[PDB]
Amino acid sequence: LSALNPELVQAVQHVVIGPSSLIVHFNEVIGRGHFGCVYHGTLLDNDGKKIHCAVKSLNRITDIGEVSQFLTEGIIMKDFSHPNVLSLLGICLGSPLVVLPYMKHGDLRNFIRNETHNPTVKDLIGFGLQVAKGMKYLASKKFVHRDLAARNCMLDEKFTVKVADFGLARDMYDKEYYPVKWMALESLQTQKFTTKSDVWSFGVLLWELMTRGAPPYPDVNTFDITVYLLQGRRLLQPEYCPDPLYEVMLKCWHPKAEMRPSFSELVSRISAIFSTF
Numbered sequence: 050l051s052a053l054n055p056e057l058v059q060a061v062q063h064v065v066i067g068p069s070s071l072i073v074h075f076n077e078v079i080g081r082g083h084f085g086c087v088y089h090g091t092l093l094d095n096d097g098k099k100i101h102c103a104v105k106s107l108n109r110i111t112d113i114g115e116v117s118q119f120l121t122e123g124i125i126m127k128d129f130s131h132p133n134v135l136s137l138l139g140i141c142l143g144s145p146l147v148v149l150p151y152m153k154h155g156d157l158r159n160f161i162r163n164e165t166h167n168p169t170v171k172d173l174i175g176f177g178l179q180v181a182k183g184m185k186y187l188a189s190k191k192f193v194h195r196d197l198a199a200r201n202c203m204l205d206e207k208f209t210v211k212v213a214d215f216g217l218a219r220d221m222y223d224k225e226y227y228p229v230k231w232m233a234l235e236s237l238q239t240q241k242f243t244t245k246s247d248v249w250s251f252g253v254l255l256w257e258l259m260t261r262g263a264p265p266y267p268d269v270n271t272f273d274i275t276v277y278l279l280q281g282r283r284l285l286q287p288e289y290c291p292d293p294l295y296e297v298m299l300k301c302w303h304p305k306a307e308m309r310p311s312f313s314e315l316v317s318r319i320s321a322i323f324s325t326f
């Protein structure tokens with residue numbers, strides 16, 4: 050750790066959590082291993098308040114070059130904060146640690162599929178609106194997500210949705226052993242991603258919400274999705290989805306990227322639909 054560039058060490062200071070400010074429960078994993086090496090933790094802020102956090106150990110990092118790049122990803126992610134985006138609490142320099150807020154209700158796809166929880170049509174639309182708000186913030190920062198889906202959004206104790214699976218919170222479902230159906234047509238064809246391809250994925254996430262987590266295109270092979278979309282076939286209107294909201298979903302899947310709504314338009318339209326409930 051003495052081998053690190055001093056100006057870079059000075060630059061990461063506002064992101065670094067001192068070792069005496071973090072208690073990691075290395076004996077308690079979060080999410081039964083499905084989310085990788087992520088543990089319960091307690092972060093102590095400047096006032097001494099105990100913060101329940103999720104602590105990811107980064108085993109893929111060994112060399113100083115990899116450590117330096119990790120410090121930089123911490124610096125940039127720390128500048129992203131919004132009520133509907135998963136915030137970085139900090140990093141701890143054993144392997145490097147990523148400290149994230151604890152999300153009591155786990156991923157949004159499992160939450161809505163959960164037979165115990167009974168979200169209403171209003172609640173599901175409200176979750177979609179929160180995702181559109183988080184994406185509107187990311188798109189305003191010129192950030193392209195590339196993997197937007199309900200499985201990649203977390204839900205906290207106040208039922209606030211947080212867009213996740215970006216920055217140091219990426220590779221969240223990478224488990225140790227002993228997304229073409231959300232992709233825009235141009236991304237399937239050219240492998241290039243834009244905010245307009247995130248809008249297409251958002252439309253698929255909205256369909257996931259309104260079907261309470263049904264898998265999209267269950268009878269279509271991932272290879273055949275491209276031709277299926279070029280034929281002009283699309284995900285159908287879910288049973289209790291209001292017509293104006295499905296019109297918004299369909300606009301997200303327009304084959305011409307420039308014809309799709311912006312996330313600002315999506316927040317606008319969905320907020321007005323949500324307000325009817």
Ligand SMILES: O=C1NCc2c(-c3cnc4[nH]cc(Cc5ccccc5)c4c3)c[nH]c21
Pocket residue numbers: 079080084085087103105149150151152153154155156203213214217218219220221
């Ligand atoms: O059944 C569950 N109860 C809580 C929970 C979580 C949970 C809790 N807190 C969290 N904080 C940040 C994340 C996402 C994340 C996880 C691993 C790596 C990178 C990012 C996260 C996920 C996942 N499943 C379940």
